[PDB]
């Protein structure tokens, strides 16, 4: 439907999870996934393999509506950010841009206590 054939992948990868949503060239979302929505639990949600299969479960649906063009904007200073890409290309999509979008404050707000573990 809508035979968009263009869009941009958003990767949001923290220390203990990983989300990949694929939306079109502007806003409105088409298909998403995350490691939790694949039965994984707890620790394992941060290994790259989780990002592998989540990228797959998103692509497989995004190209069930016609899609080649995609870019990659990676938030999320975590680990599996590149495994997400390697699964994004090698199951059909047409990656052509990588960019980093990490919020960097110019010293505005105060962060929480340091943990004494």
């Amino acid at each position: 439907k809508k035979n968009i054939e263009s869009g941009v992948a958003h990767i949001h990868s923290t220390f203990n999870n990983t989300i990949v949503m694929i939306t079109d060239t502007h806003g409105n979302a088409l298909a998403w996934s995350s490691a939790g929505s694949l039965g994984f639990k707890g620790s394992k949600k941060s290994t790259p393999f989780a990002a592998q299969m989540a990228a797959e479960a998103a692509t497989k649906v995004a190209m069930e509506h016609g899609l080649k063009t995609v870019d990659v904007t990676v938030k999320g200073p975590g680990s599996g950010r590149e495994a997400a890409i390697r699964s994004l290309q090698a199951t059909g999509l047409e990656v052509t841009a990588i960019r980093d979008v990490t919020p960097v404050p110019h010293n505005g707000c105060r962060p929480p206590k340091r943990r004494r573990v």
Binding site: T47, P48, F49, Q52, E82, A83, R86, S87
Partner: protein
């Protein structure tokens, strides 16, 4: 060891076919040091190969070896508390090691009434790209060339 690499354990080529590969195949079938039984088994199996739709036992055996041996194996490693797996290349001696090992292991599990009726049949099925040995090779190649994802910078 810790000091450094070690030797390679020279083998003695069997006198019948003058082929060190048949020697290692005899050594892998043998259990408990009963070697004459293993030799009788291998020779009956090759007799069965040539007699029934065969050309020569060395030729079809080499081709079966070629079709089974692997070329990309992975190694599951530990870093600092999280473990993964990465592919790597495969040096030559390990290749024939694995080949012989798989062939014997999966002929031992066939389900006929003689180790010869199993070995000859299994390496014939192997020289025609069939049998759980070839499927084991392909499982290995599929695990590799996929798990290169968390291996690309290892």
């Amino acid at each position: 060891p810790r000091k450094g690499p070690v030797a390679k354990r020279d083998v003695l080529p069997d006198p019948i076919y003058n082929s060190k590969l048949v020697t290692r195949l005899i050594n892998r079938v043998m259990v408990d040091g009963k070697r004459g039984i293993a030799a009788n088994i291998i020779y009956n199996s090759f007799d069965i190969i040539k007699e029934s739709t065969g050309n020569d036992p060395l030729e079809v055996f080499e081709q079966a070896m070629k079709n089974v041996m692997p070329v990309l194996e992975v190694k599951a490693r530990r870093v600092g508390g999280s473990n993964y797996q990465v592919p790597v290349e495969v040096r030559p001696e390990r290749r024939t090691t694995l080949g012989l090992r798989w062939v014997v292991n999966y002929a031992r599990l066939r389900g006929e009434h003689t180790m010869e009726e199993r070995l000859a049949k299994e390496i014939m099925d192997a020289a025609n790209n069939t049998g759980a040995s070839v499927k084991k090779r392909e499982d290995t190649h599929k695990m590799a060339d996929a798990n290169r994802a968390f291996a690309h910078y290892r």
